């Protein structure tokens, strides 16, 4: 209850939820793996 000290004990929504690349960290990297063998690309 709101007036009780245990108010908000059941809150969970902020726990779950609540590109640009800066000069120090790269934004998004795409790694392309070209190989004649299908299994080698899947394994790597």
């Amino acid at each position: 209850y709101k007036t009780k000290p245990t108010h908000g004990i059941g809150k969970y929504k902020h726990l779950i939820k609540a590109n640009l690349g800066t000069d120090y960290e790269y934004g998004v990297l795409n790694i392309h793996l070209t190989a004649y063998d299908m299994t080698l690309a899947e394994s790597y």
Binding site: I9, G10, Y12, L15
Partner: protein, 106 residues
């Protein structure tokens, strides 16, 4: 233009009230209060006492059933160490199931 009236839903028996088997504790649109010890749930999320005793409200750890996909999908996305709490209503039985009485001397 739609006209409607309140459903008179809420707590029917507060903390410490004495209830009998079948007494309705709370009527809810959604699971605001979860059934605890000796408390059943009806079709419309209605909480009724399964035993005669005193109604208690506590906070307990919420561990959903594995079959419930929506609730399981929620706890799996929680940060490690987080625990969910929800309000449970319990009925503490007052009388024993029965007593042994002498009926004959054979």
């Amino acid at each position: 233009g739609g006209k409607s009236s309140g459903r008179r839903q809420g707590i029917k028996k507060m903390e410490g009230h004495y209830v009998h088997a079948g007494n309705i504790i709370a009527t809810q649109r959604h699971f605001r209060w979860h059934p605890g010890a000796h408390v059943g749930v009806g079709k419309n999320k209605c909480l009724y006492a399964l035993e005669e005793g005193i109604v208690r409200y506590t906070k307990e750890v919420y561990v959903p059933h594995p079959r419930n996909t929506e609730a399981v999908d929620l706890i799996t996305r929680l940060p490690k160490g987080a625990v969910l709490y929800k309000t449970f209503v319990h009925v503490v039985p007052a009388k024993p199931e029965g007593t042994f009485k002498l009926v004959a001397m054979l």
